Symmetry: C2
């Protein structure tokens, strides 16, 4: 039966309204402080510059405690706002200063004072960023490949890496002190005349300086809290602030003992990561697993307060924001941070791991109803029925939550990639759908987005685009007499651009290692202290790079149409198809119709489903060939963020009948309107892809009419739909459940729908913060009933 969800405290409503009422802006303090520090450290190795910079920022950055908070730590004075990270790139920001507040979606404010202060920042960091070094390392051929509108390596180019779940459990246990002491013991073991230990020493000292700065940072909140307490009339609130002060003083360097201590230290670990770097997808992962012991051992706290504290963490996760350039902003719409948090699943020995915190996590989603955190559940063969039903009940709330992940596939896929069975069983999710063993991995889980549709376009046009030969000169499509010749050309186009994408990624990898190795983040991931070298320098036990294919359904539908309509049935010649496509079907609607009526992916039709499989495997097999400077292997993924709209706008008409400039399909979802056989048939279709090889993750969106979720039956049916998809080896699935009228109404009167949350792809967003183009893509998705 459905138990419903409990009601959150009034404090939660007040804290939540601080997020929604805020006006996202760009603040300049961090930028000024890191600039000031770098000017003083020119003579220092990069790792020490990084340590000292973080110390300087942590010591002098403005601190804020917002009204009624129980969990403190704010990265910006204004809520839901963003600091600047000029160590990675900053010229885009200098270019956009005056139009940030004019954007359709993801608008940012910026004070005239901030503009003026950034001038010196732009001046100092000229030539000194990771982005500029990265470009220098790339060949000219690669630079051209990168600007062809085939792929983008922007993510780690313009901003930090992130995409990591640190060893939170460990830091919660031993505190920032424990990390420091571990670093000191390693320094002692490394006493040696071997020159190899010189650089390792600077790294270990950097870890120590960084963690000491962390302690300092926590203590500043301890002090501010007391100071506010001394100026508070209300006895209840005054006592909260005094308890905040007490807690911060303890977890400033010690490990947590009580639950409240765990929650506050958790957030400080998470917050400080986001101060050192603005790499997003900083993902809490198995929060239920490492937080539950602190809950269960706390024999005073009430379930109500434990939940309130959790709700406060939820709200804080929505306080972080990150400004991006106007182009990249299209890739990541809706102010997203992609902080993935997962509950349930199995433990190291393959037994179920559902605990009370697992359920409180689900409860928090309904208590807070904000876009963050990106809440997820692990599903496996012995998932408790009530757990899956509780997740289904969350789905019915229409927040887009939770995303569902298949242990049965992910575990073997990970072991395949070199993880032990124990490490694989303990996986969490990074960002949207990217699996890793937390505390042990530098995964690079969103190193690039790659446009598969463009490859099909270039196969047909023999690598010729906009009057330039941008790809290999593969066989003229006009002369092709078999579909096999087409697949070969398609493979050859793919080989060329995947090659330059990955080498470009490698150039960026080197740049980060060379100019932004992270002493603080590295200290919390296994092997870094022991090897005495940063994440960037290959310290992680596990290393990967993960570029994404985008346009899967488009590729399958295109390939089957080319195969059937042209090569099998000879309805049109290759020349005719090529011309119609370049003309965007102008005055050849009859040919467009033939293409549209070819079998479409998402209807359990093997002829097309298999070509979607093979079309995607071609991408995947190419990605598998590459290794990164950290000694790790590339692994492909298939998820779009919000880039399928932008990508689609850069893509000509395709053989599936899609007009030029139209959005590509999201993830591995069937194209809009193509899945006309019910959601089970679509699930069967998507499950035919190789979800094992795409171990950087695949993303499957479905959207239901609210009636489909109504009643116990609704929950039973969604649960049954999920299980059948997972039994057939699907990787991931997630559901929008919303009334179409509400989205259209939100478009017309945004101010009336400020709290409307919708699922984009691997994350949910505040609907009205999204650009109209992304809003329309979501509205246009197929709506199913059961």
């Amino acid at each position: 039966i459905s138990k419903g969800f409990s009601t959150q405290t009034e404090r939660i409503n007040i804290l939540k309204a601080q997020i929604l009422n805020a006006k996202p802006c760009v603040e300049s303090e961090r930028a000024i402080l890191i600039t000031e520090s770098f000017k003083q450290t020119e003579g220092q190795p990069a790792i020490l510059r990084r340590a000292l910079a973080l110390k300087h920022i942590l010591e002098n950055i403005p601190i804020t405690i917002r009204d009624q908070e129980l969990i403190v730590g704010s990265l910006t004075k204004e809520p839901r706002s963003s600091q600047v990270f000029p160590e990675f790139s900053n010229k885009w920001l200098q270019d956009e200063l005056d139009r940030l507040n004019k954007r359709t979606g993801d608008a940012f404010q910026i004070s005239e004072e901030s503009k003026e202060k950034l001038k010196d920042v732009f001046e100092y960091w000229n030539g000194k960023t990771t982005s500029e070094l990265a470009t220098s390392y790339m060949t000219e051929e690669t630079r051209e490949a990168v600007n062809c509108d085939v792929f983008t390596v922007g993510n780690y180019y313009y901003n930090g890496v992130g995409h990591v779940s640190v060893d939170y459990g460990k830091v919660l246990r031993v505190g920032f002190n424990g990390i420091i002491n571990e670093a000191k013991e390693q320094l002692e073991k490394n006493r040696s005349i071997d020159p190899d230990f010189i650089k390792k020493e600077k790294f270990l000292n950097s870890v120590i300086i960084s963690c000491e700065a962390a302690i300092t940072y926590v203590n500043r909140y301890a002090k501010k809290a007391k100071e506010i307490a001394d100026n508070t009339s209300d006895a209840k609130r005054k006592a909260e602030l005094n308890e905040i002060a007490k807690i911060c003083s303890k977890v400033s360097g010690e490990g947590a003992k009580s639950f409240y201590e765990a929650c506050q230290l958790f957030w400080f670990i998470h917050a400080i990561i986001n101060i050192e770097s603005n790499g997003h997808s900083i993902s809490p992962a198995r929060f239920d697993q490492y937080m539950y012991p602190y809950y269960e051992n706390d024999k005073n706290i009430t379930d109500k307060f434990a939940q309130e504290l959790i709700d406060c963490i939820w709200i804080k996760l929505n306080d972080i924001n990150k400004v991006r350039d106007e182009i990249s902003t299209k890739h990541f719409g809706g102010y997203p941070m992609y902080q993935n948090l997962i509950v349930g699943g199995q433990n190291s020995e393959g037994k179920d791991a559902t605990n009370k915190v697992s359920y409180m996590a689900l409860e928090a989603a309904v208590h807070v109803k904000l876009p963050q955190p990106s809440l997820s559940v692990r599903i496996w063969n012995k998932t408790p029925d009530e757990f899956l039903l509780r997740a289904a009940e969350l789905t019915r709330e229409g927040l887009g939550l939770p995303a569902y992940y298949n242990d049965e596939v992910i575990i073997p896929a990970l072991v395949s990639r070199g993880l032990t069975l124990e490490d694989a069983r303990d996986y969490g999710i990074i960002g949207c759908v990217e699996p890793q063993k937390p505390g042990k991995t530098e995964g690079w889980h969103d190193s690039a987005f790659f446009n598969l549709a463009r490859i099909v376009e270039l196969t047909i046009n023999s690598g010729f685009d906009k009057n330039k030969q941008i790809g290999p000169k593969t066989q003229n499509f006009e002369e092709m007499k078999s579909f096999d010749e087409f697949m070969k050309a398609y493979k050859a186009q793919m080989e060329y651009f995947v090659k330059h994408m990955c080498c470009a990624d490698n150039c960026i990898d080197i740049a980060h290692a060379e100019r932004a190795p992270l002493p603080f983040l590295s200290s919390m991931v296994d092997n870094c202290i022991g090897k005495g070298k940063s994440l960037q320098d290959g310290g992680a036990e596990y290393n990967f790079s993960g570029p994404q294919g985008v346009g899967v359904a488009n590729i399958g539908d295109s390939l089957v149409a080319v195969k059937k309509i042209v090569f099998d049935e000879n309805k049109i010649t290759p020349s005719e198809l090529k011309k119609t496509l370049n003309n965007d079907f102008k005055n050849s609607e009859e040919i467009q119709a033939l293409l549209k009526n070819a079998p479409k992916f998402g209807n359990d039709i093997d002829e097309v489903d298999n070509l979607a499989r093979e079309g995607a495997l071609v991408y995947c097999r190419e990605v598998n060939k590459y290794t990164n400077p950290r000694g790790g292997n590339f692994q492909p993924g298939l998820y779009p963020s919000s880039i399928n709209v932008y990508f689609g706008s850069l893509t000509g008409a395709t053989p599936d009948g899609r007009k030029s400039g139209q959005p590509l399909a999201d993830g591995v979802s069937p194209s809009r309107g193509c899945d006309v056989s019910g959601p089970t048939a679509a699930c069967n279709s998507v499950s035919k892809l190789d979800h094992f090889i795409a171990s950087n993750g695949t993303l499957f969106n479905q959207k239901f009419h609210p009636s489909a979720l109504k009643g116990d039956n609704g929950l039973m049916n969604l649960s049954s739909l999920i299980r059948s998809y997972f039994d057939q080896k699907g990787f991931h699935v997630q559901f929008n459940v919303i009334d179409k009228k509400i989205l259209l109404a939100a478009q017309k009167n945004p101010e009336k729908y400020q709290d409307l949350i919708v699922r984009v792809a691997g994350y949910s967003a505040q609907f009205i913060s999204l650009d109209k183009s992304i809003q329309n893509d979501i509205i246009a998705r197929t709506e199913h009933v059961m």
Copy 2:
């Protein structure tokens, strides 16, 4: 019989006077140009910044052709002058700007315009030098050990590395074009998706850019030569200039064919090296081996013209100069560049290699009579008598040339260190006395000077000095009951300081790799192109580091005095000795007499000779423990340059009877006045040391009254002296042959003696250019007759 020496052309006299009449100054163009370039390349990896900076310098540095020159290429406008290399250090220069022309010796002029232009240079390079990164890499304990007055790692700290003989032979054969093409071929071989090839690619491109700039530079001379010809009336000089133009246009890219072409290309290789970096000891090495074929195949050139050409090289070798800080100038007195050039010896087959060019080199020394190059001969078992007697005849000229080197010890010593027998047989000398396989080695052959006398001082004082505990707290000398106890403490002091010396060297080693990898120099040393790695990054086939011990005679004499006067004979107690030494023998001349009268090194007395051996071995065994960041081993050397005087001024009274502040002994030579049994007895003493383990070279000075070399007998006696020493496994020997009166007269009336050359240690200098303290040390040396 004595053949005598031929007479140089009048042109040689003119060119020589340009050198002696010059007023050495500091010029600013290079500094301004490197600074300018670095400002444009902030976003580039270090190796490319190096290449682009070299390009910018070579394109815009002032070009000078001096009157009557046949071989052209001048690093400075003013002859015998120095550019500035702010990439290594520059604050010392900013500090000394106004007192460079006030120096006692090694004085430099500098215009007010130059001082003014250097301001922006000092400003830009703040924090950005190799020296500042080096200090950053050093631990605090090491920084203090470095500033204890025990050793100095200043050489590669304040300026460039150098200390290398590039593959001149290869570049003469294939030209800068051949080097470029080799690099272009590796680029081809290296094409791959493996990320390791990314950094190698930038190295190879940098080599290409560098060698292309080398071509540009030569072409600039070609043009300037023509322009000067066009305005020269004198038909003869006009034709010389036109021929110079022709030769430069030919060797700007191509390898040489004629002998004239080889001489000019030779000089451009050598010169450009000295533009990239100011590391000294850039040593031509086996000039007679790689230049002879060009001489022998040239069927048109006359011996006279070939000799004039060689004499022109000799003079050009004196045109290069290098300004150093106040302190470092004491380590390297006499405007020294230490460009070692060796002739004779054997080949790889173990057959004698004496050729016509070997003799023309010896003749050039007498034709030119300037301090450079540091001319040397190899001696072995089958050295032809004619050759050795001819070398003797040169020694009689009183220039301090040549330095003699013993194949019989050096060859096994090198093979011991990992060279093949073929490579070892082909060794040349670097700097003063440091052997290497030219074209295959990054030797770091003068990475430090180390004060052995201070170690004796610190053993007596239990690590305590100037009221600070600067070394380990070894056993109190007062309490010692056996000489064994003394030797143990002596070892412990040695261990501590050698450790920090070598580790300081490694920090500097890393700083050079990180901020100044050299694309141009690296391209001419084996394995660099093939490994696609700079010299700084371990590209050389052979890698070493070579720190020097100073004070060998003082150590043996001190040790025997402690052993005999204190522990054997109990003439005085340890305390009494310790107190009198700290008192500088004040009011205890009777105790000083005991010490002075103890057996002295240099008289074929085993008791003291063996302690000098062991005293030195303790240093050497310590050095052998260390490896550098290029995977090479440390090897010890025993030579002083001119630092034995300065070192002596920092050293207290020692147990050999030497008063506080007095100079230490030079190289492995006996202390002044202690060798009272003739030169043969002295060679016998010195030959008892381990010359095999000190494979970075040992240096032995003797000084003869000119009567000792009179007639055929004199020559025979010198030759017999040398043979007897080398038969007993001496490493090296060199001779001053000069009237004491002449030196004394040079002191009183310098302007009367501008062309007086004297041997210092491993090099000859213009006597009047040397500070008084070094002049006096040399005058005070023991003067022998046969």
